[PDB]
Design a protein around this ligand. Structure first.
Ligand SMILES: O=C(N[C@@H](Cc1ccccc1)C(=O)N1CC(C(=O)O)C1)c1cc2cc(Cl)ccc2[nH]1
Ligand SMILES: O=C(N[C@@H](Cc1ccccc1)C(=O)N1CC(C(=O)O)C1)c1cc2cc(Cl)ccc2[nH]1
Ligand SMILES: O=C(N[C@@H](Cc1ccccc1)C(=O)N1CC(C(=O)O)C1)c1cc2cc(Cl)ccc2[nH]1
Ligand SMILES: *Cc1c(COP(=O)(O)O)cnc(C)c1O
Ligand SMILES: *Cc1c(COP(=O)(O)O)cnc(C)c1O
Ligand SMILES: CC(=O)N[C@@H]1O[C@H](CO)[C@@H](O)[C@H](O)[C@H]1O
Ligand SMILES: CC(=O)N[C@@H]1O[C@H](CO)[C@@H](O)[C@H](O)[C@H]1O
Ligand SMILES: Cn1c(=O)c2c(ncn2C)n(C)c1=O
Ligand SMILES: Cn1c(=O)c2c(ncn2C)n(C)c1=O
Ligand SMILES: Cn1c(=O)c2c(ncn2C)n(C)c1=O
Ligand SMILES: Cn1c(=O)c2c(ncn2C)n(C)c1=O
Ligand SMILES: Cn1c(=O)c2c(ncn2C)n(C)c1=O
Lengths: 791, 77, 791, 69
């Protein structure tokens, strides 16, 4: 606990655990010694917490997800355990730099973006709320790839995060389980049997999840695939079974029907459900009480197979009758929808499923038959309603609509922001909500204020605590008390000072990683998120070039200097996203080297955007770019992180941006562009991109520069694919929000010129960010879906 | 003295006898962890394969090789 | 080639060439036997290379310089020929110590400092790049004097480098030429004739220049003066003609208008141009193609007379019309400016030139007339522009501004570092660049990585090759690959070990030459370069005394121990530089003998700093002192040698230091003090030295100690000249950069206390030194000035 | 070689600091590899490199059965 004992443990681990002394120990050795020193502090409570759940047997919550975008664990653990100050002191006394030790840790990047990071924030919140919750996923050998930029383009490198060892995971060999694939179904007089299957073992690894200052330490269980049991070739072929948990599919909001992805989904699902049933049978609590002891949240449709798998276990194995089994199943599962973009919908062809999971295909067909029998009985004449509500789309080569399977097999279905949940309920699944009104809900996303405030921005956390105490950490709504300081000049300077320090520290980072020199006086304009056409960093890029031309046309004009930062990873096979990245690095090259613009404007493509880098750049941001086309971003969470950390937002009325406006007051955000209904109008009328190109002189110059090679001289036609998409296939109407966006941007610079007014708006944003704590989000899930209670 | 060899993931196969004959099963000795080995990541080295030879005026060069890394694990004796 | 044959040749030369056997052979005999053994390996390629240039007739490059600071040739030859390992083995087997044999060789010190050493690095690079290049200079009987220190002062001794013979030169008697002096001009109806001249013969000596591992062996041709053809007195007076190539003028960055110096300049120029024209007429290629076959680089204005001489040959002798001749001339010459210090500008009084070179004075007046006629025609009303752009300064006793003559007679003019080239173009020669924008360029200096890495620091060269192959030798930019090892602990220890070995080996050298005992644990703080007020080793000395007082005031305080080394030669007539040397030896005396400081601090004035000693001390340096007043060091090259060899730099934002910062990242260098614009501000406002003396207590104590005799007890007023200069005539503002310098120095010791952090910065310096290879510099000259191509 | 270069003990003393036992011919390639390092990389002359190599290696034969060669 105290400094002396922490130093003693550190030296002890460096010695016995790392087998080193101070003259031969590497930096990595020191990081590992500290990690083990911190990890030791988790054990007692990890054991008690899990023992407690067995004793008092509260209802358990299982968050089933193919992704857990955890980031680093060291600092997060020290903070939630109240050990950071002591460890900082101990490490300092040992003559070491704790910051350096922390940078040695690899991010556990087992996620693509929002969906995976939401799972991570939820685990922190559920532990902080004292819920008997478990995270269940896959332990990928390789997470989201490390991004490099070569000659302006994205290059992918394997994310070998486990190469040096992960001290934060605990193998649980005694819980290994067999998972089945392929084979065939036999309908015997003893029950249908699934036989001649190939077997792959599932080895679980537990990672502790410390609640914030509360003695609760929950568990995240990730499964790894292992082979069971010419000789050499046979041994090498063991790689095939093990490839199942080998790599995270690098796609964000995009469906790719590869068989290996289907294997991963069944793998997690099968291992997870069996483990859950086994723990249920040992609870010394037949399966009638199951739904009162178990809640399983389906994170998107990725784990949809859990439904037919639970049915398979209840029926084929436990011999329960179908009706009883189906009843228990619905009461067990709840489904969370995370998107409305067509390219992201999971639709598995029945042939692939038939080959890999013959018995699940049969169970799904059965589910679908009973389902449609009901509709036929309710709307005998609506024949097309049946076609629309079926789990099977015969529309060409038959496929399974996984979202529909999740809806019929779940008692609750929720979206992740009001605007989104509404669209899901009344438009996308109108036929279903009409039948079961009460089944559809909304649960607006949230972020954990531990990692995204206390951890990433200690200066702000301290300043806030200075003024209003520490209650806000566990009750973020407490930030409204900050309103008492609206006219407090001294406080406003203190707030600005914290942002300035964060910017200074991040600028140091930028100068050492990039050739560029940073004007620390500039406004940090930031857009960090996965590269997507719908998120439109392309629009941001149009505005950047626009500011460039303005400086060239009139260099002596008064101008608020900016440092424009854009970062994010493109899915490997997403060609347009890769072109967009190259467009940004090209533009940056011209801008950063034009002697006429100089320190007026700097552009940086932030490489390898991931959780640990987000913790650095967000606290250093002044302007947060949340410009997705109205109706495309289901919720967003980066928007919330920026709001909590003192940045103002420039964005569309989309996803949770709408709620950030409700809480803070629309005028305290720079809202702009078409709204959901305006986008529909343009669609109805038909979008003619050329018209804006024609009518907007600044837009036309930008476009022409791009298309003629102004930014790619050595290859004039390089950006032709973008031009063509922009003029003839822009599903996201980049040109249609261009004018309002730029006008809006000008207004931002205006406000920035007035520090007191700017920080006054910042204060209103921070003071109103309380609704976005994931602790609030989780309370709502616990109360209205899982029916469990905080402790 | 130092012993130098390869850390095979699988050693000599485990032998089973089925219906009077030898049957081989993978010897997955590291599955549960080996407390007796100590990874020495700071001594990793690159090993070269394939490629081609170039006889330059600065000495013969072996180039265009494929690289595989070698990670040493120390076991106390 | 192999060991057996090398031993056989060695014995053969010891026998037939040195007329010795193993029991009577001297060390010098062994060195000569090895030298001839190595030299034999150059012949075949020397002959083929020169034959090749005659056959394929590529355009030739002639580097005309009064200086070639070559250093020793043995090791450099063995290395560039790939013979070092074999010779080392052969010599070892013969029971000899090759290191001892190498120390027998005299440096060919035919240069003063940076300017002359740049010429030497350029020859190595041009041969390594396979260019048809020739170095042209004077074979001084005596080079830069050998420096001795007696009773703390510099004493000069003749550098009789040819006394024992130079095996590396080859007399070329068949190319001897007559050079003319004095006489008078006659304007006859057959062309103007220069008559009644005194004749001095020019005998050329060729020295081979081996390219690095490529079969190319170029030539350096140095001319020696000889007399043509009371009797005894007449024979003795032959010495007068021969005195022309007798001694190198020992001035660095300082003009001295002695008639003998003027004779040397015309001598090289006249012999060189004639030889070039003769080779041109034999090329079996009238003079229209001359500029397409010849490029002549003027190394500073020293060879400025080449311009009127080329005109004289074309006109007076080849009878070409003036306009045609002037056109060919400009296309032939390019000029390199090496400094902006006033005291270094060449301004020859017209009377001296009129007496010695009557015809050249006429040609220069003519050039000037056409020149001004043009300006008058362009700016009729700007009368003062004419005065400013004239080749003649009537400002008192008329003199010729040689830089102006080089500018009008050349098609390209270049500075030696961006900051310098800019000052030359937009300030010093604004009137000229305005007229011919495209005439002015920049060519940042470079150093050869053969002599300054492979040769001088085999340990580092090997370590680097170990990690990244050998491509870096010919493409130094390859050192950026070293960035992959930033977190590689083992590599960082290996790097430090190489520096440690170099320090150990150099410490042995120091202890045997100097009374002092070296703490091998100390940081080697080094400043080696010619003694100058602008280079400020005086400032370094102020800091040394400052550290001294600190140790005296608080002996028990934690302190990083240092070995401070300062070395360099003072021009014989540079009084202040001589006082500064005496100040340093005096300070060192007190410091090295004060029992209270002991091994905490040692000070050494490195005697006889020259090329071969630089190769020893540089690889042993931790801290490199590059502290010239902002705007005074045009480029610097020592700074580059230190960077390449693993030392960190403490310096001002001056010359190439600015570019070393751009490449490595300003934070990876210890930059400090006023910048170019701050120096101007202080000048405008007026520099009041006393103010800093008054306000800085540590400075005041240092100054008082100096002025009261603390360091010169037997003579209290000894350093009065320095005190007076420092308070009333310090053109280089020593006091004004004192505070920042000392603060900066403290930061250095801080970093040194952290080995891993220190070597991490070192690695970033080495990995970023690639731009400073002279191979890159030469490629730029070839492409943008000489219009020739690498082979 | 790396451990040798750090011994603060060029390669002349190598065989006095190192002995490598070849357990059967399986690691036979060690011989040409040591030569490759000495020559291609350390630039030592062949004769010198070959001398150091032989002083470094010792070979143990474990069988005379043809099928095992
Ligand atoms: O593996 C040991 N310590 C462990 C310590 C450790 C544990 C978990 C994560 C990181 C580090 C070790 O160094 N690693 C496990 C990692 C891997 O599997 O790659 C690297 C160890 C200590 C020790 C001490 C003796 Cl005397 C003999 C063998 C030993 N092994
Ligand atoms: O892995 C841990 N201990 C290690 C201990 C160990 C190390 C080496 C051999 C056997 C056991 C562990 O259980 N294993 C490494 C093996 C493998 O590679 O599969 C199995 C561990 C302890 C711990 C304690 C907390 Cl609080 C959180 C995570 C933790 N992991
Ligand atoms: O001077 C060389 N050879 C000597 C050979 C010689 C020696 C003695 C009398 C006549 C000729 C030479 O040419 N001369 C010495 C005379 C003098 O003092 O002027 C002229 C020499 C050979 C060689 C070969 C290479 Cl690769 C480089 C430089 C070289 N110099
Ligand atoms: C929060 C977060 C996201 C989601 O960001 P949006 O802007 O909401 O898409 C993606 N990646 C990382 C690393 C994050 O931390
Ligand atoms: C390189 C070199 C110089 C030039 O050094 P600066 O510090 O650049 O003035 C001077 N003398 C010798 C012997 C050199 O090798
Ligand atoms: C498929 C997918 O990744 N959906 C993403 O889910 C997160 C978390 O709900 C939302 O914030 C975001 O808007 C949405 O694009
Ligand atoms: C007259 C003279 O010696 N000039 C010197 O030239 C060298 C080579 O360009 C520069 O590095 C240096 O700064 C400068 O002082
Ligand atoms: C979002 N996204 C992708 O992620 C993608 C893609 N094509 C391939 N990939 C991977 N497309 C067209 C797409 O819109
Ligand atoms: C690396 N890279 C790409 O990734 C790429 C491309 N053109 C299209 N893409 C996607 N080019 C030319 C390219 O070099
Ligand atoms: C019938 N049979 C064989 O004939 C045989 C064998 N293994 C080797 N052979 C030759 N096994 C396992 C076997 O069942
Ligand atoms: C650089 N330098 C000299 O080299 C010099 C001199 N006076 C004489 N000499 C030789 N002065 C004043 C000077 O500044
Ligand atoms: C040798 N020497 C000098 O070179 C010198 C001097 N005083 C000035 N100078 C330059 N004194 C006293 C002296 O002995």
């Amino acid at each position: 606990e105290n400094v002396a004992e922490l130093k003693k443990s550190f030296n002890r681990h460096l010695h016995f655990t790392l087998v080193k002394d101070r003259n031969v120990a590497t930096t990595r050795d020191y990081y590992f010694a500290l990690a083990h020193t911190v990890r030791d502090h988790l054990v007692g409570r990890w054991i008690r917490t899990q023992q407690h759940y067995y004793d008092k047997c509260p209802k358990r919550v299982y968050y089933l997800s193919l992704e857990f975008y955890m980031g680093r664990t060291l600092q997060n653990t020290m903070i939630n355990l109240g050990l950071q100050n002591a460890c900082d002191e101990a490490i300092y006394q040992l003559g070491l730099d704790i910051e350096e030790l922390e940078e040695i840790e690899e991010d556990a990047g087992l996620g693509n973006g929002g969906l995976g990071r939401l799972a991570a924030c939820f685990l922190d919140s559920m532990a902080t709320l004292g819920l008997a919750a478990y995270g269940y996923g896959i332990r990928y050998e390789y997470g989201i790839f490390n991004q490099k930029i070569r000659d302006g383009w994205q290059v992918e490198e394997a994310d070998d995060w486990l190469r040096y060892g992960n001290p934060w995971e605990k193998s649980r060999p005694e819980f290994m389980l067999p998972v089945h694939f392929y084979g065939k179904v036999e309908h015997t007089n003893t029950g249908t049997k699934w036989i001649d299957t190939q077997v792959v073992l599932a080895l679980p690894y537990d990672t502790p999840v410390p609640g914030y200052m509360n003695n609760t330490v929950n568990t995240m269980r990730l499964w790894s695939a292992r082979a069971p049991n010419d000789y050499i070739q046979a041994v090498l072929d063991r790689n095939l079974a093990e490839n199942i948990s080998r790599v995270l599919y690098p796609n964000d909001n995009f469906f790719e029907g590869k068989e290996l992805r289907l294997k991963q989904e069944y793998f997690v699902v099968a291992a997870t459900l069996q483990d859950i049933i086994r723990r249920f049978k040992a609870s010394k609590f037949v399966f009638d009480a199951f739904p009162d002891q178990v809640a399983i949240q389906l994170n998107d449709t990725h784990p949809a197979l859990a439904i037919p798998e639970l049915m398979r276990i209840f029926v084929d194995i436990e011999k329960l009758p179908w009706s009883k089994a189906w009843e228990l199943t619905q009461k067990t599962f709840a489904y969370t929808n995370h998107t409305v973009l067509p390219e992201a919908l999971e639709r598995w062809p029945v042939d692939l499923v038939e080959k890999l999971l013959p018995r699940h295909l049969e169970i799904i067909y059965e589910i679908n038959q009973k389902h449609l029998d009901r509709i036929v009985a309710l709307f005998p004449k609506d024949v097309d309603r049946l076609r629309r509500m079926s789990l099977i789309e015969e529309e060409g080569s038959k496929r399974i609509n996984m979202a529909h399977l999740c809806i019929v097999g779940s008692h609750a279905v929720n979206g992740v922001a009001k605007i989104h949940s509404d669209i899901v309920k009344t438009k996308v699944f109108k036929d279903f909500s009409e039948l079961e009104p009460d089944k559809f809900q909304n649960k607006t996303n949230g972020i954990t204020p531990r990692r995204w405030l206390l951890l990433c921005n200690p200066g702000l956390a301290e300043l806030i605590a200075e003024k209003i105490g520490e209650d806000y950490v566990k009750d973020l709504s407490q930030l409204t008390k900050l309103h008492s300081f609206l006219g407090d000049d001294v406080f406003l300077r203190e707030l600005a000072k914290v942002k300035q320090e964060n910017k200074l520290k991040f600028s140091q980072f930028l100068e050492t990683e990039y050739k560029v020199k940073i004007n620390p006086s500039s406004m940090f304009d930031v857009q960090v998120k996965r590269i997507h056409e719908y998120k439109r960093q392309l629009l941001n890029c149009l505005h950047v070039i626009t500011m460039y031309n303005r400086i060239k046309k009139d260099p002596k004009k008064l101008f608020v200097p900016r440092t424009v930062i854009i970062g994010g990873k493109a899915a490997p096979g997403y060609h347009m996203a890769k072109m967009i990245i190259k467009l940004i690095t090209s533009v940056a090259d011209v801008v950063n080297n034009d002697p006429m613009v100089g320190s007026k404007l700097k552009v940086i493509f932030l490489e390898n955007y991931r959780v640990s880098l987000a913790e650095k750049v967000i606290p250093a941001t002044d302007l947060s770019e949340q410009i997705s086309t109205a109706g495309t971003e289901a919720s967003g969470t980066g928007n919330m992180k920026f709001m909590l950390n003192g940045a103002l937002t420039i964005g569309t009325m989309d996803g949770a941006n709408v709620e950030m406006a409700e809480e803070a007051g629309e005028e305290n955000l720079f809202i702009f562009g078409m709204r959901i209904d305006d986008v529909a109008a343009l669609d109805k009328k038909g979008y003619e991109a050329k018209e804006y190109y024609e009518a907007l002189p600044e837009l036309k110059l930008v476009i022409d520069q791009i298309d003629n090679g102004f930014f790619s001289p050595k290859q004039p036609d390089l950006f032709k694919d973008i031009i063509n998409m922009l003029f003839y296939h822009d599903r996201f109407k980049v040109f249609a929000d261009y004018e309002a966006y730029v006008k809006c941007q000008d207004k931002v610079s205006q406000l920035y010129m007035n520090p007191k007014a700017w920080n006054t708006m910042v204060l209103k944003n921070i003071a109103a960010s309380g609704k976005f704590s994931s602790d609030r989000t989780i309370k709502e899930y616990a109360q209205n879906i899982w029916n469990v209670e905080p402790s």
